[PDB]
Ligand binder design. Structure first.
Ligand SMILES: OC[C@H]1O[C@@H](O[C@@H]2[C@@H](O)[C@H](O[C@@H]3[C@@H](O)[C@H](O[C@@H]4[C@@H](O)[C@H](O[C@@H]5[C@@H](O)[C@H](O)O[C@H](CO)[C@H]5O)O[C@H](CO)[C@H]4O)O[C@H](CO)[C@H]3O)O[C@H](CO)[C@H]2O)[C@H](O)[C@@H](O)[C@@H]1O
Ligand SMILES: [Zn+2]
Length: 241
């Protein structure tokens, strides 16, 4: 019912796609829907992406566009928000001052690692008396077998066990980035993982929300829909609770 969402971008048919797949919520990596008209029953969640995303105007835009706030995207990656724990802590009061339910920055990896980016952020927030309501995560599996769903579950459990905040999974797919270019599963491998991973997540009481990366093949080869047509993975996501 309540957990299943998606990342999305404006394309011809986005509204129908969101409706047909049964998304309860969506985000755009921006402070507003970036031209997308949401179907009825589909909640937009704003994001404050990076350092230069933190202005009065963006924070007010976000608060008018929704009731929950996602903080910086992959601050631990040079190619994304690319930010120190200290820069993220120093901007935090501006995000807190909106009064919105507030999600931690979403780390690319290492969320459970002592001394990692997330651990220093949460440790510093607690010492400053800051509020962090939930922890959003990213996960991309390189093992394309039936074992993948268990590997994802282990990472989510470890982050819950470390910080005891409710968990969102705001990007997930099978993709191996270890090599010089990305490596993807066969279509049948992907659809089996969609089924087994959603069943696992729908039943895990400390996961509040999840978002397959991503709605549309025009964003990523792991896309669920081309225009308004679902592939076997979109079919599997639509059939999830
Ligand atoms: O200071 C750091 C950099 O600041 C930049 O300017 C900011 C500007 O980039 C930002 O615009 C938004 C885009 O960042 C955003 O792009 C989304 C991607 O972040 C996302 O990346 C995922 C990633 O999270 C995951 O780990 O790996 C995925 C798989 O490889 C990867 O794809 O992908 C999304 C899908 O393509 C993509 O949309 O999109 C937003 C929505 O359009 C943009 O708003 O906005 C900021 C202002 O609010 C700018 O400060 C500079 O360009 C850089 O030079 C700096 O290094
Ligand atoms: Zn400082």
């Amino acid at each position: 019912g309540t957990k299943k969402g998606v990342s999305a971008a404006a394309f011809s048919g986005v509204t129908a796609a969101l409706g047909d797949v049964g998304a309860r919520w969506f985000y755009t990596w921006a402070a507003d829907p970036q031209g997308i008209t949401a179907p009825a029953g589909t909640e937009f969640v704003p994001m404050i992406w990076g350092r230069d995303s933190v202005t009065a105007d963006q924070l007010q835009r976000a608060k008018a566009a929704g009731s929950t706030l996602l903080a910086f995207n992959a601050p631990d990656l040079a190619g994304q928000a690319n930010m120190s724990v200290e820069t993220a802590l120093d901007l935090w009061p501006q995000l807190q001052a909106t009064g919105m339910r507030l999600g931690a920055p979403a780390v690319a990896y290492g969320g459970d690692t002592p001394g990692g980016w997330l651990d220093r952020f949460m440790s510093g927030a607690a010492a400053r008396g800051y509020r962090v309501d939930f922890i959003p995560l990213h996960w991309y599996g390189g093992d394309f077998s039936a074992a993948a769903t268990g590997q994802l579950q282990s990472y989510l459990q470890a982050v819950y066990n470390r910080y005891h905040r409710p968990i969102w999974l705001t990007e997930y797919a099978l993709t191996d980035f270890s090599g010089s270019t990305p490596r993807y599963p066969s279509a049948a491998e992907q659809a089996d993982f969609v089924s087994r991973s959603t069943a696992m997540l729908n039943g895990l009481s400390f996961v509040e929300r999840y978002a397959w990366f991503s709605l549309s093949t025009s964003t990523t080869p792991t896309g669920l829909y081309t225009g308004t047509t679902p592939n076997s993975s979109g079919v599997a996501y639509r059939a999830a609770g």
